[PDB]
């Protein structure tokens, strides 16, 4: 039993996040539990105030018309509780919801663990015989506690996109509004856990430039290569198959070449010191040892630069 | 309370994506959010719209008969909720509902990492009385947002086969509706983080085709096969125990091989160069560094073809 | 409100088998969705059929007295939407459910990666002042589609006991009838995975019976040893802790020594090799040469023997 | 409406264990399957059998006063459909669920392999207006199937403590019964995969007593050394932490200072060897092949002893 | 339908923990089974006791007017069972649930191993037509059994804080209460598991300092390290990503150093001993011998002080 308007219903909306959690790099989706807030004007439930109750009634959702707003990007469908129904005198209804969903919005690993990413909330409408149109109620949108966690992001702001965008869809049009929250990543704990970790292991690997033993040398190159992979695919596990080259796996990546030629390095400061010329050989094993240092902060310039200041 | 047709009752479906997710490899399954819509006439509902209301009328579900459309490869049935109904003046129904289902399709690995797959949704009907047959309304079949995710696949394209395949279950006759979703997979990343690390440790392997010290080349050739393992493992995680050769583990497999013989030579390489024989201890050796990179790069052309260009 | 039989009251069961999945060697479980049919005489809902509509008619379940058919070795009440009622004028009734249950079969790991399974559904009724006795009708059990997947697994047969078990429970007998689902593990792919690497690195383990460096006889077959570990553990993950022997933690284990003595040896023709006795230390190296691979290969045929061939 | 008793109202409780399963070492707790039974006279239900049907009557849960059987060491509340509901004419009433809960019960990992756990079930009953007090019914009771499972345990005996204990909680009293299972662990797996894996190691380790290369006596105690860390950190996964010393956590730390030792023994037949005093050395090593393996022989004895003998 | 308080409605809470688990350090949550008691003034359901029944009716929630008691830090909303309503004649009203919630209280792994942590359980109740303030009953906040388990923490105290927060939320106050859970982390296991396997392969890596081959000294040094990774990764397991910087962690870091400078004095000892300078050579091999552990044992009382002392 839909309000009978005169033109285009609005509906005024507004979410106010009271949790959220459970971010998932991998799967691309995040847990949200918050309020959801609607008003609209049925002139029908218009009543004299004096001559019954008070300012405000209350209704259980059943005896009202109340306006299905699905959320888009939702895994199943939201799990909800509602509130508090308010119908003003006018006809004005005020809906409470307190819903709890797996919101599933994509993220942008390009600059990975010094990433931000902007996640969404969307809330389409679909229309009947008065065409709904949404639109936010920024009293009710100020949706945030001051406690909201999601761990290892720090959160920037949650606000929302005034215009909704009015499609038509099979033959009724929609309208969709966009809840926005933008978060930064806590790089922090890269550092100390993987970052560092892997650059020692780098640096070890090429003391086999001050070191004559290729028997030494390959056990000493040869096993910090190894512990890169426990690194590489470390990282590789809490991170989708991004169609593109992601930062972190950039560097993680570069490495690998530096293993690959240090190798070939120790293999020719042997092949030339045994070829009797080591005149040769501890000429290139002398440069190694300020080639490749130079050679990786440069390329890491290069690279940092490449993704970051671009 | 079905409606009295004449001969077999066409229902008519069509799927609007919405959303597209968590593709599964390993389990064989994805999730989506689509509009469910059907159609069809229930010569009953018609009503004069002159003497009556408007254009349409909405019920509610318990209202009017409405015809149970299951999926068919689904974990459980879906979770839908109706969006809305509308008759028409000669008992034409307007159902449209918003499906959230998790969906079983199988998926062939055979050029794993290079694979191209096609999804399925299916739709029964059970019928009763009259016959009914499904048929696919291609005006809300379109069914696919312009935003429809899928991280790490190219959805290709979300079309449906017209002609359902009317079974006969148990003594009623079922029709069934092919729903299909192409992708093709986002194949990039496998490159910095398996194909290409693992191509390097490779390489590494067999520098003790340029070495001489038995201990440095086992050092050598066996701490860079462990490593290799980390990565065929790391792999055979991410994907199930197919019956069939994986493109990719054939490769992975191809190598153990190319390791194996490796150590063989640096193994013979020794017992020959200490079977005071180095004339022929540093010609294998001198060969071997040829030989396996050829045959290598050899057995991939035949590999690549023998799967991709078949 | 139960049918007044004249005996026990016969109920006819029967599944068809939609989905299969999820199939778990560590829990012990798989998943299931398929169909459950039962029948009975209510002679009550007899009607005349040409006094009354047509020849059945159809209730919802609250009408109907209707038998409470639970399955036996689940983990919660299985989820089931009822499909259809249909009371025949006799008053016989054709009920059909969609269930989707998971279920608890335990498995026989004796041959492990070449063991067979027979899973288990139950189906109890309690009975209550009708005695309630199952029983199956096979043209509703020939439940198993042509697309039943179970990944990892062949498919060999799903069938029923047709006798079932009459137990007395705590004072109103019940009636149990057992439906079977018979598989093959897909042993395939845990040669490439499993069986060969780990037969390799085996191999490579024992070329220090050609070498004379203790130095690299340890780097050597230590090396090796562990990456065993790293099969052995891989494996005993995917696997429950059976309190009996599995085959292939059999041959997993019969390594091991093979591992040890090997090791003994090296350290022998060392001891030996330096308490200025070749003569024997290159006797010893000469034979373990021989020993191991035909102990090993004889140790396999007995132990393969020992397990299948018993 | 409770059943107006003329003193404490008994109710007749009894446990039939159908499925038993998932036992989690880690999180202490255990599913069960089983059946409730429970009795109590309702003299208000009473019927004259003559004047009315017959031996007994049976309702819904809705029609009876059912007193409220909460479990006690549960995750959530139980998953219980109910099976039968039967009035004896006096007012005696037969309730029968079939619930399937997830228990909370702790373990004594103090003897870990070869420990022995025993587990509850508690039922609690809020008393009102007349005092309710539980009570076992032993013919309910022998509540366990001939199939009850537990992988990885042996089950010794399922039974229950007659005498209910009657807290007062909040100013009512609760009765609370102490329903018992008894299990045994199956260790045989533990010995093929974990102890016998590892005491191999640790043997391997100490032929450094019978070489003399402290170049491969590192390559080769060390080795080992780890592999006794991936033997370590497997067992401390499936296992919580206990604040107390778990028996295999002692030897397994036990063996951790004869690797200790023992390096400090090579290091030392090496800085003796060194200073030109072999005549040391050789006696070092001489006596060390002998010492270890008779400490640690008496060590476990000591050990073991403390532990299983205490 | 509110009760006509004459100023904010006082509402009595109280929870008794019955259960308490899975408390999960890297999510920052844990379940709990408690009792939910509520007390308030309902002048309305007031009743001669002696015109009517007894001192207390009995009523179904739909019935009476209940205030809605949400928790604030819950995943979902919780699952619970009322298990009593008990009206006096003043109209005082006796609610008693029993919840099962999953709770999100953060941690401070700023001690990790030796930490200790504050739970928390929030309860607000929204305001209307009367103000609800909540406040706490302590009779039924004694809430904690003497069986409350939580693995691997002693539980020290459940207790609340008895003034309510009271918020304005949207435009009707909110009130708020805090329930406190402390705990301290059974730390001991991290002992033999993790602390002390740590520090032997620390230890064992610088025997280096009393060996003189380059070649047996990183195969010592060297494979020392990579244990050390699989007891980092180990341990950044079970353990979020903290911004901050974890005791544990500290140490598990400051030992890499430990490892690296290892490392070049290794390296260093022999670039001098064959500079043909072994005069300083075993004079350098002769203080790290020295300097190591003091430096360290140093370091780590400067951290361990750092941590604790602070
Ligand atoms: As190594």
Not at 111 to 133: A, G, K, M, W
Not at 167 to 187: C, G, H, N, P, V
Not at 228 to 240: D, K, Q, R, S
Request: glycine fraction near 2%.
């Amino acid at each position: 039993p839909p309000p009978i308007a005169d033109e285009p219903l609005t509906v005024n909306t507004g979410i106010y996040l009271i949790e959220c959690y459970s971010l998932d790099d991998k799967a691309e989706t995040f847990k949200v539990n918050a309020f959801l807030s609607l008003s609209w004007k049925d002139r029908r439930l218009a009543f004299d105030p004096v001559r019954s109750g008070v300012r405000v009634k209350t209704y259980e959702p059943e005896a009202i018309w109340i306006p299905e707003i699905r959320f888009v990007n939702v895994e199943n469908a939201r799990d909800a509780d509602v509130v508090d129904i308010s119908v003003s005198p006018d006809g004005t209804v005020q809906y409470l919801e307190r819903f709890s969903a797996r919101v599933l919005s994509p993220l942008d690993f390009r600059r990975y663990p010094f990433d931000s990413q902007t996640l969404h909330i969307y809330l389409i409408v679909r229309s009947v015989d008065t065409r709904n149109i949404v639109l936010a109620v920024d009293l009710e949108k100020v949706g945030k506690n001051d406690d909201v966690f999601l761990t290892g992001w720090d959160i920037e702001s949650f606000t929302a996109v005034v215009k909704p965008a009015n499609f038509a869809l099979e033959d009724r049009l929609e309208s969709k509004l966009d809840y926005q929250l933008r978060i930064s990543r806590q790089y922090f704990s890269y550092i100390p856990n993987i970052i560092l970790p892997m650059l020692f292991i780098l640096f070890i690997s090429w003391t086999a430039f001050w070191s004559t033993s290729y028997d030494a040398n390959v056990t000493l190159v040869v096993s910090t290569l190894i512990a890169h992979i426990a690194f590489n695919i470390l990282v590789e596990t809490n991170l989708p198959k991004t169609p593109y080259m992601t930062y972190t796996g950039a560097i993680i990546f570069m490495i690998y070449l530096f293993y690959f030629v240090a190798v070939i390095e120790v293999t020719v400061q042997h092949y030339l010191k045994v070829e009797s010329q080591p005149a040769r050989a501890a000429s290139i094993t002398r440069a190694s040892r300020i080639a490749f240092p130079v050679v990786f902060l440069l390329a890491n310039i290069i690279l940092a630069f490449l993704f970051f200041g671009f």
